[PDB]
Paper text:
In the present study, the gene product of gene ID 9704440, here referred to as MmNQO, was cloned, overexpressed in E. coli and characterized biochemically and structurally. Based on the results from these analyses, gene ID 9704440 codes for a soluble protein of 196 amino acids. Based on structural and biochemical data, we suggest that FMN and NADH are preferred, which justifies that MmNQO is annotated as an FMN-dependent NADH:quinone oxidoreductase. The biological function of MmNQO is yet to be elucidated, but from the data presented here it may constitute an archaeal counterpart of the modulator of drug activity B in bacteria.
The crystal structure of MmNQO features a homodimeric enzyme where each monomer adopts the flavodoxin-like α/β-fold commonly observed for NAD(P)H:quinone oxidoreductases. The active sites of both monomers are situated at the dimer interface, each with a non-covalently bound FMN molecule bound approximately 8 Å below the molecule's surface. The flavin isoalloxazine ring is firmly bound by the protein with its dimethylbenzene nucleus interacting with hydrophobic side chains (Trp89and Trp90 from molecule A; and Leu48 and Tyr53 from molecule B); the N5 atom of the central phenylenediamine ring forming a hydrogen bond to the backbone amide nitrogen of Trp90; and the O2 and O4 oxygen atoms in the pyrimidine of the isoalloxazine ring forming hydrogen bonds to the backbone amide groups of His135 and Ser91, respectively. There are two non-crystallographically related homodimers (A/B and C/D) in the asymmetric unit of the crystal. In each dimer, one monomer (A in the A/B dimer and C in the C/D dimer) packs such that the ultimate histidine of the C-terminal hexahistidine tag is reaching into the flavin pocket to interact with the FMN ring in a crystallographically related molecule, i.e. His203 in molecule A interacts with the FMN in a crystallographically related D monomer and Asp156 in a crystallographically related C monomer. This interaction places the A-His203 CE1 atom 3.1 Å from the O4 atom of D-FMN. Although local conformational changes may well change the precise details and relieve steric hindrance, His135 is very strategically positioned at one side of the FMN cofactor to restrict the substrate-binding region, a feature that does not exist in bacterial FMN azoreductases. At the sequence level, the region responsible for binding the adenosine part of FAD in SmMdaB is overall very similar in MmNQO, i.e. loop A (residues 9–15) and loop F (residues 173–182), including an important interaction offered by His9 to the FMN α-phosphate group. An additional interaction to the monophosphate is provided by Tyr53 in MmNQO, which is absent in SmMdaB. In the FMN-bound state of MmNQO, loop F is folded around the monophosphate moiety whereas in the FAD-bound state of SmMdaB, the F-loop is folded away to accommodate the adenosine ring.
Numbering used by the authors:
A (entry chain B): -1 to 113, 118 to 201
B (entry chain A): -1 to 112, 119 to 203
The structure:
Amino acid sequence: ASMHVYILFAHPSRKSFSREVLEAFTEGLSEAGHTYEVGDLYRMNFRSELSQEEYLREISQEAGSPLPEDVMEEHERIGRADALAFIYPLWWSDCPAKLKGWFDRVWTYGYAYFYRGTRIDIEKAVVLCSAGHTEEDLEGTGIAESMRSVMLGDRLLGVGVKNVTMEILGGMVPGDDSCREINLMRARRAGRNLEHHHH
Amino acid sequence: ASMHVYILFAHPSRKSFSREVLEAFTEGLSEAGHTYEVGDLYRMNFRSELSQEEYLREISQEAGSPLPEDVMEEHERIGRADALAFIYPLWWSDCPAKLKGWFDRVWTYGYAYFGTRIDIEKAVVLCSAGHTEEDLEGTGIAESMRSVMLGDRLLGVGVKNVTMEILGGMVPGDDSCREINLMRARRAGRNLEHHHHHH
Ligand SMILES: Cc1cc2nc3c(=O)[nH]c(=O)nc-3n(C[C@H](O)[C@H](O)[C@H](O)COP(=O)(O)O)c2cc1C
Ligand SMILES: Cc1cc2nc3c(=O)[nH]c(=O)nc-3n(C[C@H](O)[C@H](O)[C@H](O)COP(=O)(O)O)c2cc1C
């Protein structure tokens, strides 16, 4: 059955490998008959810093407290989705600040977590992260593990996403296209195969 | 010997536990004869998003290419220091987007990596968390944070020695761990000079 994905995309450039990954993933989605919408956070000029007001609201732990309009819009986008996707380059072993801020501001008390329960209704999340380092190298530095723990674990499974998968699209150092085609295939496959998961 | 510390502080609120942590840490530094400068990133209106123009510069990998004025100022502040400190609340298992963006923008090619130009004897991380350090150690999050913050972002750019204190148990409405955590923060300032040496 057709699924609808909300894809969070975090990159300042119009053209970069991350954009190609987005194109490949959506290509795979289309082949399988799935749809998507994109939260192109840089192009949206999405505010990434949790404000003093928002912080005080979060600390107050009042699930019915107001949220800013941009966060309300994000929640509406998620509400239309059966799946989430996150497409970004690995910067200093985590997401770009812009996407980190999306978690800080959008994973709100009473929505992503409350006292622990959740209101997020998402069957699957796909993380497609491109890195300069190879997957082999990222495993050795504990960085691959940190990504599974922090991104897949804490930020996704930890807020009620039912199933998660990640492709670390590694080896993407400047001026080296050797891993490009293989990584784009992995992205296409991820979109084509969205409906399938563990049980 | 007296050391100078450049302290990166990341929190939107005028009053928070992190602010008291800063106060406790600075008290210890002064007790021990050390000096410091605080970079209050929110107060500074610090731009946390790596822009398209900065991105192109970083990808080009030209050590001598121009840097934004705000980044140049950060490099001067670091240059005056013998030590760095990072004081922030744990948000979604990493630092606030504001501090993440500081790494994205300030750890530039030709400076933080290329070899390194960073000349810093010690970095201290004081991270306040809702979860206890015990629970974070148990789940793998503490290890992830060591791999990411201590490993990649600090040791990985040439910092010679690193320490992280997880000041945990700071859940809303509970002051039970407050005094002990402030004691730890103060101690970290007082004991800044402590370092391992060959037997
Ligand atoms: C600011 C910055 C930080 C980066 N940090 C890492 C890193 O921590 N680990 C890694 O493997 N690659 C790192 N890289 C390399 C990027 O992951 C790589 O350039 C990216 O995946 C390429 O995708 P893009 O063309 O969409 O930018 C970094 C690149 C930049 C510009
Ligand atoms: C947006 C947000 C995200 C948080 N994420 C985490 C987390 O991932 N793990 C954790 O142990 N505590 C988390 N907390 C609890 C904070 O770490 C806690 O509020 C903070 O340490 C208190 O210090 P402060 O008064 O300086 O903000 C989070 C709090 C907020 C507001």
